[PDB]
Design a protein around this ligand. Structure first.
Ligand SMILES: Nc1ccc2[nH]c(C(F)(F)F)nc2c1
Lengths: 1052, 218
């Protein structure tokens, strides 16, 4: 009677191929069996099949193949084994000679189980540790050597400028400057503190503790000082030795001479991890100190002897690889000499996958672009619809060839008929050598792939798909009797001064003032600054574009206005652009947070971008670089050509600063599998790995480790699925006990923080978590000498399955909010735990000890009789930790953290917060995990929602043990934090708008286009006033909680 | 204005003009302020009038009421049926993208696998030719020297080597024809996505028809 007896015939249960991203040690098989048959091919021609062990070294199988070749024919024709080396084909499909013969059979990635013997061809065998680089990069280096494209060959050879220069800078004041590279100081951007931190110091003094180790070494020694927060390490080193050596047998004078000798032989190291205080900064400017201040901790430093630190730092010793009018060009013709409009011949798409029936007709659409468009889109005529389609037409684009701006691009697609796109591609109208393109080109196309209903897609990547098996589309680019080039800077400045002087003598009348004297209007002169302060997505009217464009020379006094100005320029005017080029030449620098906007997808022009790089070169600190390193790396994707200013800028800072270098390496490597960027990023990785010194060997351990964990988890997620956790855990431990695992997963640096060493695995405390993606919870001994003062055991989570890089961004934004708030007075303690995407849906996530979800809290306190959970269980659990004077502070923390997170989750619009999304620490801090879809992707089915809705539970904790908790003064002070915080982020809205814009380069489906970012404009309410936005925030907070949020403020 | 930004930009998506609130109003992306009240032709008559006539660098108004294809109650389910079509179509759309993705990565795994095969073979072809140098440099004896203690077992190596190669070339062959059907299956998935696309766009457009007329289920 339920379904009106209607059968579903189509339905069937057996494999419904209906789950309701995803090789290992050999081809097709993850884990090679413990004994295996390995064919050994020799110079004899004899293929003697050995059975060796999975985990056996090449040294072992060699010194056994030596002995068991004495049992086969032609023996005296085999040389001494010490004159031989192995080689085979790998899964990447190359002949990998096997030099480091300590390597085990399972680590070689062999495809087919066999070896071949040969002699050391290329006797410079130390040179053929490009292998290291290839391993590190995740593709072979020789794959670059056989690339035709000169741009690539030119990138590799010319980018060594930066490498060599940067290596010289490292060995300037050595071994100090080497230790600056290796152990750069970890310090905040401001030397002064916010006032709430200061006030935990009794008029600016920290109680420190210095530790020493003199032989027998066995013993260590506290030296507790009480010194100024702003005193440098040099001073703290002194006062520490004063105490050590003070005696009844030293006078004051004889003490000071002992101090002076000992002073300059030591430096300060943080206890329990490889951080170091290596230059003149206030102690509190270093982040460890400022963490210790806030957390309620006494800094534990250590006097490290400079001998024993400079002992650890090895020589980097870079060397250049095998890749080591007056020309045939004759600058043949300047672009501006040419007399015709652009036309481009489209002819024949080789194939397209469309139905003859369903789709009626098809055509190749085209348009010329500069981000946004400089003429009408030129569709081609319909032909041979859905069945071997070829054209042979020229489309005539209304722009005179001299007008084409330096970064102009053909954007094309192929559409259907009721329109939808089939495939797409774009081309740089100028090549990397400033040459305007001519001849025929073969543009292999991309899929749309998802979402993108728009016909053309110019925000996508330039160049052809490196998959040959795609819609190809041949086309001819017009030829002007001779090779064309973009004009020199000499030419453009000359034309600028001309059209500048041509302005000066124009008539009294000119469509009034449609696009244009020194009469400096005073209402207008305030309209510029009003527009200057607007957000990047506040769409500008062409009236304002002219208005701006006309007073261009005035705008130079408000340098901040430039992003608005540049979007106002007509790029299909050679005249306007030439003058803009000359403004940008002299234009004075702007704040790095604005300059970053000028490396997003709307500003392609090399001159504009070179400016942006120069702003960052002067103004952006190494601290603020490593904050914003993610965006800067994703913004390389939008650069036209391989060699450019921004890549040189980043490659240099990566080779300056091993903390940057590390994340600069990982951030490229993680996007490597993505074939669109694959080539740009590899060549860059190749240049970095070649120049970074011994760190390459540290990375190779990190990579080698990750591969093991990827491989282990793959076996768990396929095959060992549908097995009890008890079974899976017997497999997990068996495998980590294996010796190749022990090799690979023990001596290395946590990629989440290379500062923290990972030593021996405590298998005891390693386990496969409950989640279906089978994340591994790993746990290593901290092999530091002072592990006791930080953490005896470092543990982090490895998750193969989820795409981390969304989390990666929201945590980044959270950190940036916390810092805005902190230095603007407001203490709202967020916890942006560490997360790192290291590959296609694979990553690492920091654990946060002594934290549990609200669900777990409620199960401990949850009364044995399973009726209902009480809301007070949280509040009671929190009291049971925090008793006495403690208790009040534990609430203060909760209230502060809750508020901070209330604001951020509303603003970012992250996934709905339920009980297993929110966690509470024993000390009483609240923080969110697993954020999911961030700018409200969940509206695409059917608003402006509050995802963090304060249940009764939280409100109690906020107001202490309470009845009617929304009326308390505790809750008022909470409400005020939200109002001060919400405004604070709003006042820095530009940064977040840009930060998101820069992240359109990544493949994340929550950032497809600028209209996805629009949400963040609504929720911060920038089209309204700040008093309206406040009231909007209060409104929306009132809506979700059902009352509470009706208030007023005294200060405006 | 005669009553009888984010959403204005979103509704302008997929259209090769319209009036909006804030100057006090905005003709729309190419944004035109209505500041340019207080002029000839009371607001609305300036809109009917039209663009080169003032601006150097310069037919389809959008306000269809969408009764084109009367209840309030019954039209409420005409969303609930079209949106279930839309979402079941959407579900099927993005179902095949997983297959489109998985197959394409599976495909490129096969050619890179085939390159390893091809290359592996070239080492085995080179190995049978390695012995015929070094075996028939010592076939000098042929019959004598304790009969055939050498040359019988040399032939066994050569026999396995060649029959091994045999199996490798079979394995590649097998993979190459695996790739072919996969190539055809890939193309076939893309084919049905392109027929679904405009059905899915029209269904999403016609879902907007029954939404915007009316201005729980979903
Ligand atoms: N503290 C600090 C921060 C960034 C710096 N960049 C340079 C360089 F001289 F440009 F290398 N010196 C710096 C010192």
């Amino acid at each position: 009677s339920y379904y009106h007896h209607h059968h579903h015939h189509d339905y069937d249960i057996p494999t419904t191929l209906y789950q309701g991203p995803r090789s290992g040690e050999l081809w097709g098989i993850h884990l090679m069996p413990p004994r295996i048959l390995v064919e050994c091919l020799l110079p004899n021609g004899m293929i003697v099949t050995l059975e060796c062990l999975r985990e056996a070294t090449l040294i072992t199988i060699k010194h056994e193949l030596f002995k068991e070749a004495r049992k086969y024919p032609l023996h005296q024709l085999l040389q001494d084994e010490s004159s031989y080396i192995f080689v085979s084909v790998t899964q990447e499909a190359e002949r990998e000679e096997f030099f480091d013969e300590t390597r085990r059979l399972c680590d070689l990635r062999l495809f087919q189980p066999f070896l071949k013997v040969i002699e050391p061809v290329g006797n410079r065998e130390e040179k053929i540790l490009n292998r290291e680089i290839g391993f590190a990069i995740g593709m072979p280096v020789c794959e670059f050597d056989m690339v035709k494209d000169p741009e690539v060959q030119d990138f590799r050879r010319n980018i060594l400028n930066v490498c060599k220069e940067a290596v010289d800078l490292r060995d300037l004041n050595s071994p100090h400057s080497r230790a600056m590279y290796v152990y750069p100081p970890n310090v905040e951007s401001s030397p002064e503190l916010p006032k709430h931190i200061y006030n935990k110091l009794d008029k600016g003094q920290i109680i420190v503790v210095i530790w020493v180790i003199v032989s027998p070494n066995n013993d260590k020694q506290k030296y507790t000082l009480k010194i100024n927060h702003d005193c440098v390490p040099e001073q703290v080193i002194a006062e520490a030795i004063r105490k050590k050596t003070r005696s009844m047998l030293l006078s004051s004078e004889q003490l000071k001479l002992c101090v002076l000798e000992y002073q300059g032989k030591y430096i300060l190291k943080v206890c329990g991890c490889d951080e170091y205080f290596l230059e003149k900064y206030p102690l509190s400017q270093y982040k460890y100190i400022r963490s210790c201040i806030m957390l309620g901790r006494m800094p534990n430093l250590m006097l490290m002897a400079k001998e024993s630190l400079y002992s650890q730092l090895p020589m980097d010793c870079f060397t250049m690889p095998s890749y080591s009018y007056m020309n045939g060009e004759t600058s043949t013709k300047s672009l501006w000499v040419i007399n015709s409009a652009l036309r481009i011949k489209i002819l024949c798409a080789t194939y397209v996958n469309v139905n003859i029936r369903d789709i009626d007709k098809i055509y190749v659409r085209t348009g010329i672009y500069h981000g946004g468009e400089p003429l009408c889109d030129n569709v081609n005529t319909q032909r041979v619809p859905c069945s071997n389609p070829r054209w042979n037409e020229w489309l005539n684009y209304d722009i005179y060839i001299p007008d084409l701006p330096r970064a102009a691009r053909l954007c094309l697609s192929i559409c259907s008929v009721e329109h939808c796109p089939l495939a797409w591609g774009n081309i740089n109208l100028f090549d990397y050598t400033d040459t305007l393109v001519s001849g025929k080109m073969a543009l292999n196309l991309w899929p749309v792939p998802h979402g993108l209903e728009d016909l053309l897609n110019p925000i996508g990547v330039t160049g052809s798909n490196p998959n040959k098996e795609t819609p190809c589309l041949e086309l001819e680019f017009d030829w002007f009797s001779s090779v064309v080039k973009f004009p020199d800077m000499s030419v453009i400045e000359e034309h600028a001064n001309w059209s500048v002087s041509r302005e000066a003598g124009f008539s009294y009348s000119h469509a009034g003032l449609s696009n244009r004297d020194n009469e400096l209007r005073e209402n207008d002169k305030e309209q510029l600054k009003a527009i200057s302060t607007r957000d990047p997505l506040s769409e500008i009217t062409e009236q304002e574009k002219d208005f701006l464009w006309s007073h261009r020379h005035y705008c130079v006094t408000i340098p901040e206005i430039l992003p608005k100005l540049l979007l106002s320029v007509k790029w299909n005017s050679r005249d306007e652009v030439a003058q803009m080029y000359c403004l940008v030449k002299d234009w004075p620098p702007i704040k790095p947070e604005q300059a970053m906007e000028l490396l997003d997808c709307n500003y392609p022009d090399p001159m504009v971008r070179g400016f942006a790089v120069r702003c960052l070169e002067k103004y952006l600190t190494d601290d603020k670089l490593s904050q914003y390193l993610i965006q800067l790396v994703q913004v390389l994707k939008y650069e036209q050509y391989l060699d450019n200013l921004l890549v040189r800028f980043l490659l240099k800072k990566a080779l300056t600063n091993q903390r940057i270098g590390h994340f600069f390496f990982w951030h490229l490597k993680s996007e490597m599998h993505n074939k669109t960027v694959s080539q740009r990023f590899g060549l860059l990785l190749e240049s970095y790995c070649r120049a970074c010194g011994m760190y390459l060997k540290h990375l190779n351990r990190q990579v080698e480790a990750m591969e093991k964990l990827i491989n282990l988890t793959d076996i768990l997620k396929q095959e060992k699925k549908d097995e009890t956790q008890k079974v899976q855990m017997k497999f997990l431990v068996e495998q980590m006990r294996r010796p190749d695992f022990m090799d690979a997963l023990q001596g290395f640096l946590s990629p989440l923080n290379p500062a923290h060493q990972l030593g021996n695995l405590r298998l005891e405390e390693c386990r496969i978590m409950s989640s279906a993606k089978r994340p591994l919870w790993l746990n290593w001994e901290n092999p530091d000498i002072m592990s006791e003062l930080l953490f005896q055991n470092n543990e982090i989570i490895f998750k193969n399955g989820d795409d981390l890089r969304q989390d990666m961004l929201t945590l980044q934004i959270i950190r940036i909010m916390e810092n805005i708030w902190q230095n603007q007075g407001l203490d709202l303690r967020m916890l942006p735990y560490g997360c790192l995407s290291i590959g296609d849906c694979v990553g690492l996530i920091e654990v946060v000890r002594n934290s549990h979800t609200i669900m777990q809290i409620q199960c401990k306190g949850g009364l044995k009789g399973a009726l209902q959970f009480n809301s007070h269980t949280l509040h009671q659990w929190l009291k049971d930790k925090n008793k006495g004077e403690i208790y009040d502070a534990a609430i203060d923390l909760f209230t502060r953290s809750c508020a901070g997170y209330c604001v951020a989750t509303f603003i970012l619009g992250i996934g709905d917060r339920h009980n297993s999304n929110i966690m509470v620490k024993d000390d009483g801090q609240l923080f969110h995990i697993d954020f999911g879809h961030f700018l409200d992707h969940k509206k695409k089915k059917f608003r402006e929602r509050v995802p963090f809705v304060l249940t009764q539970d939280f409100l109690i904790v906020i107001s202490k043990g309470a009845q009617e908790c929304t009326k308390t003064r505790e809750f008022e002070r909470f409400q005020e934090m939200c109002y001060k915080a919400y405004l604070a982020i709003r006042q820095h809205a530009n940064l977040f708008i840009n930060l998101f814009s820069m992240m359109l380069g990544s493949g994340m489906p929550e950032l497809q286009s600028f209209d996805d970012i629009a949400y963040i404009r609504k929720t911060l309410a920038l089209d309204k006033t700040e008093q309206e936005a406040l009231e909007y925030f209060m409104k929306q907070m009132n809506d979700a909680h059902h009352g509470g949020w009706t208030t007023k403020m005294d200060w405006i | 204005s005669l009553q009888d930004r984010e959403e204005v930009n979103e509704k302008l998506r997929d259209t090769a003009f319209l009036v909006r609130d804030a100057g006090d109003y905005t003709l729309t992306n190419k944004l035109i302020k209505i500041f340019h009240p207080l002029t000839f032709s009371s607001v609305v008559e300036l809109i009917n009038h039209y663009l080169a006539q003032y601006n150097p660098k310069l037919l389809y108004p959008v306000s269809k009421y969408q009764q084109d294809q009367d209840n309030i109650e019954a039209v409420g389910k005409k969303l609930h049926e079209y949106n279930t079509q839309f979402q079941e179509k959407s579900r099927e759309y993005d179902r095949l993208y997983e297959e489109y993705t998985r197959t394409s990565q599976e495909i490129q795994m096969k050619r890179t696998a085939i390159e390893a095969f091809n290359e592996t073979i070239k080492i085995f072809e080179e190995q049978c030719q390695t012995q015929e140098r070094y075996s028939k440099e010592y076939i000098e004896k042929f019959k004598r020297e304790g009969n055939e203690k050498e040359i019988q077992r040399i032939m066994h190596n050569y026999d396995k080597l060649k029959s091994r190669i045999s199996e490798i070339i079979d394995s590649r062959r097998r993979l190459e024809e695996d790739l072919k059907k996969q190539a055809a299956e890939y193309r076939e998935i893309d084919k049905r996505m392109n027929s679904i696309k405009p059905d899915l766009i029209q269904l999403r457009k016609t879902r907007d028809q029954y939404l915007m007329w009316l201005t729980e289920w979903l």
